Amino acid sequence: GFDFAVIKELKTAASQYGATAPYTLAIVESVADNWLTPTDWNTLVRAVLSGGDHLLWKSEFFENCRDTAKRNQQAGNGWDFDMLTGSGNYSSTDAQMQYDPGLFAQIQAAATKAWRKLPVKGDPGASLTGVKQGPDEPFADFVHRLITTAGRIFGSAEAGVDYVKQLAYENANPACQAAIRPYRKKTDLTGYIRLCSDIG
Amino acid sequence: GFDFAVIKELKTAASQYGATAPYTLAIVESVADNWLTPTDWNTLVRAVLSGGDHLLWKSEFFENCRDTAKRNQQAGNGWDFDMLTGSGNYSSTDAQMQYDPGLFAQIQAAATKAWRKLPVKGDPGASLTGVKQGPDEPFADFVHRLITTAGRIFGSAEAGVDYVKQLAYENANPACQAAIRPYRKKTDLTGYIRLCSDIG
Amino acid sequence: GFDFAVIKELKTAASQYGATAPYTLAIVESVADNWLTPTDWNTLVRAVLSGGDHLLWKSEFFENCRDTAKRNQQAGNGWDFDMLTGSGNYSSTDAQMQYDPGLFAQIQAAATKAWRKLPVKGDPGASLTGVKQGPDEPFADFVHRLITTAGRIFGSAEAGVDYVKQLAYENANPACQAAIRPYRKKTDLTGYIRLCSDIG
Amino acid sequence: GFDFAVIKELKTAASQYGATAPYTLAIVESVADNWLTPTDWNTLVRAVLSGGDHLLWKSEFFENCRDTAKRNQQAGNGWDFDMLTGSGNYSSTDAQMQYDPGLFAQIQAAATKAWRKLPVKGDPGASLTGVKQGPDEPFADFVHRLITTAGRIFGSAEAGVDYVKQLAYENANPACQAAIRPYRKKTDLTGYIRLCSDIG
Amino acid sequence: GFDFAVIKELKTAASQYGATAPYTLAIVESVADNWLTPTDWNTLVRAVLSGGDHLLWKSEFFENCRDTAKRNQQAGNGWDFDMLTGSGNYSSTDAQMQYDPGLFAQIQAAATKAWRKLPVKGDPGASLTGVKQGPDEPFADFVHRLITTAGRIFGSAEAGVDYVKQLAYENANPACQAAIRPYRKKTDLTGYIRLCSDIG
Amino acid sequence: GFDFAVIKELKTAASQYGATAPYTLAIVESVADNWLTPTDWNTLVRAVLSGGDHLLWKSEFFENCRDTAKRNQQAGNGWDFDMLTGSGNYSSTDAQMQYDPGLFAQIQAAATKAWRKLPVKGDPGASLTGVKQGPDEPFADFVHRLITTAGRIFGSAEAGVDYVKQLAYENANPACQAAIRPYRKKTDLTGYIRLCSDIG
Amino acid sequence: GFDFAVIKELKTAASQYGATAPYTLAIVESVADNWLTPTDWNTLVRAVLSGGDHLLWKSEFFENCRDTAKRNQQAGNGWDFDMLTGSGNYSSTDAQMQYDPGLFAQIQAAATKAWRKLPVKGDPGASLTGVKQGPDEPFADFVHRLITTAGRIFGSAEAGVDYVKQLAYENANPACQAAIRPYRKKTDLTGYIRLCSDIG
């Protein structure tokens, strides 16, 4: 089916998380769940994504998939042109929907393979390590935001380290961080959540 | 074909990088390139991997793939039992090799889908952030090792940050780090490669 | 097949590890993988091993296996003499190879049962607890050697204890141990690998 | 024939020298020596190179070469579609190998023309002017490396100038450069090779 | 067609830039655009160029092109003598114009291949690094001249470096350079264009 | 008709003004006035412009225009392939000129729609806010240049503001600006044109 | 037969020794040992050598050898055109191999005569008299290198003279030469080999 808003949302996450974050490809493959055409899949993506990424993925589609077609006719499928074009001649919606289910397996695998291929820019997440917690904002909630998105981008929650500790420290508001740095070194989450829980 | 050593190597990388590092799944899908049986694929993996991971992936194989079979017979493939068991009745090597190429697409997609599913433990890389550069070891080569594997695990080379700077610092030998910390703060790779290039 | 060198190697390990170390019986059963004659198995072992061990195992073979034959003819196998002698009358290589596969199961089980029976001397590993690390030798590599072989003999890596700590200590070179004992008590592997990493 | 490693090597040189260094195009035209298909030539290059470069060169291939086809049919060749597509309809390996030798001349000229067209990024060589000679590394060998690669990139050995002299100076180790700068100004290669030839 | 003046101009650029500067071969291949005879091409070049270069290129023409003819008759072109002489027997203008278009591809490729081969002297550009800006001449325009021609010869605009900075410095008039050297070190183009913009 | 020089000129303005300045699209649509082929329009633009921009615009041409073709055949035009390819099969110049005038309306609208789509880099005008008036150059003429081009890029003459006042100030020569800043704050164009009108 | 590497090696020696050193012509005549075509001999040499040398030798070949042909037909050989062209009409490999053995004598003599004719530049050996022994390098081995190559170029080992003595002296490292010059004048090889045999 046509996913509209969640597509927009993953595009937003793609610009913040990058088309490499376990998040993004997880959602990719999640949407790939449905028997549907790569044609509109890719029109959709080039709508959210930017052109050359798209057309490159689809050109490598043509190349590798028609090599697969070589193999398929070595095995003798008798296919690979029309659907395995994205749209060959009359793939107008349903005429493309005429997929073989194993042909659907092929097309879905190829689309996700493509999407898997091309590299992201390489720097959409800097915000994570960046400025701080907002001063008025609650601290532990900010830290929770931090570790959750750090798992999102780093790929695991188990990135937490004195690196992450001083990341939160610098990111804490001047009040809370100014309490923590004189508080102790080797200070753990319990100390922070204990201390800075007020407004004043 | 039977990949032996590189399989061993990815298993080693899986215990160090984890079955989440872009490295590991990249190699997974790279090996998935060949028309072959998921049966020996999975026997291989359960040989390198540990059992429950394997049999769980293959049970979810059965479940989701026989739902796919529901759909396939809604479309009317007339298949999904024998090959889409891993081995149904007489999948003895070649009799399994009797795959439909679209059936191969399905099985490869399902295997990689499974492997994609289950979570790693969550902490095979601690060594990265860990002890140091060896004292006798050359420093810049160590740093190169660091950023390369940091890209391996973090998923991008663009993790480098004053975090990574003090990571190298602590990791540098007492000589080089003892030169760098008095040297300057805000010190970049050029400074390190400049300074500590000797033996004495 | 004829394993030559690895047999020699396990014999070496048997004199150092003893025919009790999980290592040795693991390799025993690993070699037992093949449909082959206990005859040459045992000629091989008595070649590496020493006679009375061998002939005793094979005498208990005769005894328990011919009791098994009692049972087999209670069930009525109609066998147990020729092959279940090791060589009865014309077991000359292939004529012995005429094994029943369930007969092979029996013979392999009996051979490994025998090998399992007789006791080792009781002291081939003293070297482990013994003299030291060589002075010029690297320390942490020595310690790694220590814990690996300690797992080999003790049967688990989880023998490591302040016992093992002072074992390494005494075993460390006079330099490193003379650094460690004044360094601290309750000192862990991190401390050792940290300190003694040099040559001078 | 299939050049594998040297292709990898020129790709490495392309990232260091750039697809403009006399080196790179010299090797390009050197490989172009053989009667072979631009199809796999270009698949190869897009394998080493990055996509848009490739497909752009091949699109301009289509454009200019089909203008050439205009001319060819003004002269009346009766060709330019199938081979002069890269693969028109059945250029499957040998069916493409069905080239006319003058048609091969055309295709080789067109491929090299394309490759000649598109511009490099513009900065893969900075290393040349960059950090230094390694301190332990021998100096004159480093200088030799310098002038050789300077010829590689600049296109001639006759770039050597007091620019290059102070380039080597800065690049020399602190020992050798600290000897040379007090040594003299207007110092030539003979002076450097004379002075810094030791270890200490 | 007969290019007269631009040929003269590239010859001038060849004596200043050398028959290696991306400029010169770019113009070479640009003129090669037309279906025409290598005969007058080469008469033209030996008119601008100097003899041995020419006749050497054309001798290697004969050699490599008649090896190509070997191959062509292995493929069976049935040609290579008359046109693939430059003029065999009756190549008098139009009778040479009787080229096959694939034969034209061959001849153009061969001519440009030749021209590509032979080496320049090795030092036509010294003027670039040389004397200075004229004193009365405007400085920034001179610098623009510098970087443009430096791109011409070096092959890229990205040669600009403190080398090029002191090149302009020395090249600046005594007034402007005498202002700049006391002005600052690490001075960029903005500083120069800012300062020396006057006459007095 | 073939516009040559003005095309070059708009390309120059595109690199200085950007393909967003009201100037550039005004000229675009001005040239679009003529019944002509998008084919050569786009060959022209990709000649001045850079490839991916072009081919992207034309790919979106294919996509949206063949959706328009969907609609056209819902209305039943019976067209959209050959001309609405840019060149389908025999669009060789006149055979493309066989456009329907409403088909020309479509193609012109599509071409300008494309050109309208893709984004400029985002920074070709910095010169505007940049260095200054040349010292010898007349001031008010420079200011006139400023406001005219500021209208060109900003899209209106009504950008003039104390921002623009200090822009001219900084841009004025040291003489004139050094007269104006002590002259007054809130100084208008009349003051500047009054004061700095001399040479000395 | 095709000598590849040794040809490369003599070319290297030709650039260092010059095509006059007894070495080079000795190797020339050594290779001339085989009944083979001067055609590929000369293609080979012009591959290692540089063109005008080659074609000049072969032009004088034509001249003197066709004078020899004058004489041959005064004696009435009835030959000298085809083979005594290098390749007359159908000297394609074997058809050239159709040499008369006395004709081979003629062609070999002519080729070596040519090669004997033309003069070397006149200065490829300066290195010999040049910089020094490397400081770390062993001295007597360096001296051995010296006299061996001095025999190579000078044509005899009996060049050794107080000239050669001070050549080695200057060439000795500062240590050894600084020992020798105060050691004695009229010092012979025995003194040097005696003294400087150490490292320190």
Author numbering:
A (entry chain B), B (entry chain A), C (entry chain A), D (entry chain A), E (entry chain B), F (entry chain C), ...: 19 to 218
What does the published report state?
Intermediate- or high-resolution structures have been determined for the immature capsids within a β-retrovirus [Mason–Pfizer monkey virus (M-PMV) (4)] and lentivirus [HIV-1 (4, 5)] as well as for virus-like particles mimicking an immature α-retrovirus [Rous sarcoma virus (RSV) (6)]. Surprisingly, the quaternary structural arrangements of CA domains within the immature lattice again differ significantly among genera: although the arrangement of the CA-CTD appears mostly conserved among RSV, M-PMV, and HIV-1, the CA-NTD arrangements are quite different. The general architecture of the immature MLV lattice is similar to the previously determined HIV-1 and M-PMV Gag shells: it consists of a hexameric arrangement of Gag in which curvature is accommodated by the presence of multiple small defects and one larger defect rather than by Gag pentamers.
